[PDB]
Amino acid sequence: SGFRKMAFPSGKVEGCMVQVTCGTTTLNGLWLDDVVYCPRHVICTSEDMLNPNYEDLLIRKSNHNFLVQAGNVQLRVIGHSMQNCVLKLKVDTANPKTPKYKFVRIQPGQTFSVLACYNGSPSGVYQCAMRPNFTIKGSFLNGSCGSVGFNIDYDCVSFCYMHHMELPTGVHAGTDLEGNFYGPFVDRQTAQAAGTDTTITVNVLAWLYAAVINGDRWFLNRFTTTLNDFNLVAMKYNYEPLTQDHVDILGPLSAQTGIAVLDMCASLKELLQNGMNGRTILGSALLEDEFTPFDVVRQCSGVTF
Amino acid sequence: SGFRKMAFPSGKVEGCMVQVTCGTTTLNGLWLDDVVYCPRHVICTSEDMLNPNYEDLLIRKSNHNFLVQAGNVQLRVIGHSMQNCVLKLKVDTANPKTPKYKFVRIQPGQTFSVLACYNGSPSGVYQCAMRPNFTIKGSFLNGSCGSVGFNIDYDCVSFCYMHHMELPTGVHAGTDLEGNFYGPFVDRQTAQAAGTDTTITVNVLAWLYAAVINGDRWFLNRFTTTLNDFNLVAMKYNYEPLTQDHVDILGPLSAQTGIAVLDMCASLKELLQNGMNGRTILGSALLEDEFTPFDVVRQCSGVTF
Numbered sequence: 001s002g003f004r005k006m007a008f009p010s011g012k013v014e015g016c017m018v019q020v021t022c023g024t025t026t027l028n029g030l031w032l033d034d035v036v037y038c039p040r041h042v043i044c045t046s047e048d049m050l051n052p053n054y055e056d057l058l059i060r061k062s063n064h065n066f067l068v069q070a071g072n073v074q075l076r077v078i079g080h081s082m083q084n085c086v087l088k089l090k091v092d093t094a095n096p097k098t099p100k101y102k103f104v105r106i107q108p109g110q111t112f113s114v115l116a117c118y119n120g121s122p123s124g125v126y127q128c129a130m131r132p133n134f135t136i137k138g139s140f141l142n143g144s145c146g147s148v149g150f151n152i153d154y155d156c157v158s159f160c161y162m163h164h165m166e167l168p169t170g171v172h173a174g175t176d177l178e179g180n181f182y183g184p185f186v187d188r189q190t191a192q193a194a195g196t197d198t199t200i201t202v203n204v205l206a207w208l209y210a211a212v213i214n215g216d217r218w219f220l221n222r223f224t225t226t227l228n229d230f231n232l233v234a235m236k237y238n239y240e241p242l243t244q245d246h247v248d249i250l251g252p253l254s255a256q257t258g259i260a261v262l263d264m265c266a267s268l269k270e271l272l273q274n275g276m277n278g279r280t281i282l283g284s285a286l287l288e289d290e291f292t293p294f295d296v297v298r299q300c301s302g303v304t305f
Numbered sequence: 306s307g308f309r310k311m312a313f314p315s316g317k318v319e320g321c322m323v324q325v326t327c328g329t330t331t332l333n334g335l336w337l338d339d340v341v342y343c344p345r346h347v348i349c350t351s352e353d354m355l356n357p358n359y360e361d362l363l364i365r366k367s368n369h370n371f372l373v374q375a376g377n378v379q380l381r382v383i384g385h386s387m388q389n390c391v392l393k394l395k396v397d398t399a400n401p402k403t404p405k406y407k408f409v410r411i412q413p414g415q416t417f418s419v420l421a422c423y424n425g426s427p428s429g430v431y432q433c434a435m436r437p438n439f440t441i442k443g444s445f446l447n448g449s450c451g452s453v454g455f456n457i458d459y460d461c462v463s464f465c466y467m468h469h470m471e472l473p474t475g476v477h478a479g480t481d482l483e484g485n486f487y488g489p490f491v492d493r494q495t496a497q498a499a500g501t502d503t504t505i506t507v508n509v510l511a512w513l514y515a516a517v518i519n520g521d522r523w524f525l526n527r528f529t530t531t532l533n534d535f536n537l538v539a540m541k542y543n544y545e546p547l548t549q550d551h552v553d554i555l556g557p558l559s560a561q562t563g564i565a566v567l568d569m570c571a572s573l574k575e576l577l578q579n580g581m582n583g584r585t586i587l588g589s590a591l592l593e594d595e596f597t598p599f600d601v602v603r604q605c606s607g608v609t610f
């Protein structure tokens with residue numbers, strides 16, 4: 001009945017987006033309770049960013065050097081501190097629109113929605129996966145830093161990402177909401193290598209199950225394989241090795257479609273060796289790896305929040 | 306700096322989603338001011354849907370036969386009427402979260418965000434285009450009817466779509482908010498043909514401009530073409546003919562990239578004749594046609610709402 005890359009409804013997060021200005025630099029902050037969270041490089045000049053000493057730069061700043069705006073309202077900053085790569089500004093007003101929330105550090109291969117923001121105002125929402133090399137393939141312009149990634153569980157917002165920088169390959173890097181970067185990255189304007197990326201194999205299988213559920217079945221073959229035999233083909237094509245934990249996660253989808261996981265691996269094997277030779281799967285000519293098994297079950301079961 | 310299929314922030318629309326129940330059928334309604342809008346087939350049994358006489362079916366219904374729920378609050382229905390294929394339920398309470406809004410009928414090739422909903426509760430958001438044959442390629446399960454499509458202009462929500470049905474090819478059909486179907490469709494469970502679909506040529510060109518802006522330039526060639534010569538190739542590949550109105554719409558993107566529109570047409574010509582032969586453009590192995598020129602300018606200029 002159709003399969004789309006779908007983001008969580010962004011309303012609860014929209015109510016937490018504020019604008020943080022320090023000197024000439026403005027970016028986005030996240031206002032929860034009486035604390036505003038933003039990237040610490042808000043305190044940097046364009047020259048500072050080449051080689052910042054953040055402890056020294058922050059010591060030159062006082063509470064009144066930080067301007068925080070929620071729409072047109074001006075919040076008063078009554079304290080500040082650095083936690084890893086995030087700045088925490090204590091304000092005198094608790095956000096009346098604070099949702100039930102958690103801070104989580106997500107695992108590579110997991111997905112989340114991004115609310116892209118500029119000057120404290122939401123611009124758009126999209127879905128992405130934390131790559132195995134801990135980058136994301138986003139859409140971020142200047143001023144977008146401090147935009148956040150999140151998942152929604154019924155009424156609880158789980159914040160997992162805040163945007164900090166663009167890498168030389170054009171992908172994006174950021175932190176969890178405790179300020180710890182995903183991956184080996186630092187918040188400095190210097191050349192930084194992401195590792196070779198790999199394809200999230202369990203996600204591709206989930207999407208193949210999604211395809212079968214939605215009527216696409218041409219890629220199914222009469223072959224099967226073994227976990228070790230498939231992983232031989234995974235390594236060659238830079239796919240993550242498949243484990244029994246992955247098989248178990250795919251179990252419910254196996255049970256609904258009546259297709260054994262290792263049979264799907266053999267179909268995927270032949271796709272990897274023989275290509276698509278011009279056909280499409282769920283409207284894509286590529287093998288898609290940014291849908292988790294949970295994502296597929298949610299979209300095919302119509303879970304609401 | 307990255308290019309993603311991006312939906313509008315959905316917060317303003319989330320506050321307008323209610324649940325409408327008539328008899329055993331429940332679907333989604335849109336609560337604006339003191340009126341709730343929903344598909345008229347909420348009044349149908351599963352048997353009625355094969356060949357409904359909506360005027361006769363509605364006459365058997367009174368105000369108290371319609372249950373409208375906003376979360377846990379129960380709205381009181383004080384009037385009802387049929388406008389084309391939508392039911393309008395007058396309630397005793399105006400929605401306190403009503404945004405500034407307009408009802409618009411969009412043109413084929415235009416795009417909008419869909420807030421997919423079940424039992425009155427938002428599930429997810431995604432972006433899509435109204436196809437030239439007036440279908441959309443959505444993700445809609447049972448109970449999703451009455452979910453709406455919209456655009457956002459600063460603070461004004463322009464509602465353009467409400468979901469009614471799935472076609473035999475698996476695509477989706479619906480109405481504007483005055484209840485008039487897009488395309489030749491009727492709200493009855495019968496086999497219904499959509500026309501052959503065509504590719505939105507001006508959208509593909511906008512996306513090619515997006516690619517060049519974002520560093521993908523391999524598809525650029527040393528050739529040019531003419532409007533009539535390109536349209537010869539468009540007809541063969543089921544692409545919409547390109548007009549001077551389309552060229553004019555692409556003008557700003559031409560000026561920024563320094564690439565004449567007709568030169569891009571020649572690049573697209575060679576893509577259409579020679580395929581992609583294994584390369585990718587902005588992460589896709591297909592030519593993408595669900596980004597309007599406005600969409601590209603917005604994402605590349607960071608417009609907020």
Ligand SMILES: *C(N)[C@H](C[C@@H]1CCN[C@@H]1O)NC(=O)[C@H](CC(C)C)NC(=O)c1ccc(-c2ccc(OCC)cc2)cc1
Pocket residue numbers: 027041044049140141142143144145146163164165166167168172186187188189190191192306
């Ligand atoms: C947040 N507002 C901003 C987001 C950027 C702007 C454009 N799109 C990106 O998402 N973040 C920054 O501007 C950030 C500030 C740092 C202090 C973290 N820096 C970068 O994004 C950035 C860092 C480094 C490079 C770079 C350096 C050397 C290179 O040499 C290899 C050829 C390549 C790239 C680029 C951008």
Ligand SMILES: *C(N)[C@H](C[C@@H]1CCN[C@@H]1O)NC(=O)[C@H](CC(C)C)NC(=O)c1ccc(-c2ccc(OCC)cc2)cc1
Pocket residue numbers: 001332346349354445446447448449450451468469470471472473477491492493494495496497
């Ligand atoms: C709204 N809740 C619902 C959305 C559907 C359900 C599953 N995904 C869809 O978006 N809409 C309906 O159920 C709608 C009710 C009508 C009264 C408008 N009907 C359909 O979606 C529907 C109509 C017709 C067919 C169909 C009939 C004959 C066929 O023969 C050709 C082989 C094919 C298809 C299917 C679905």
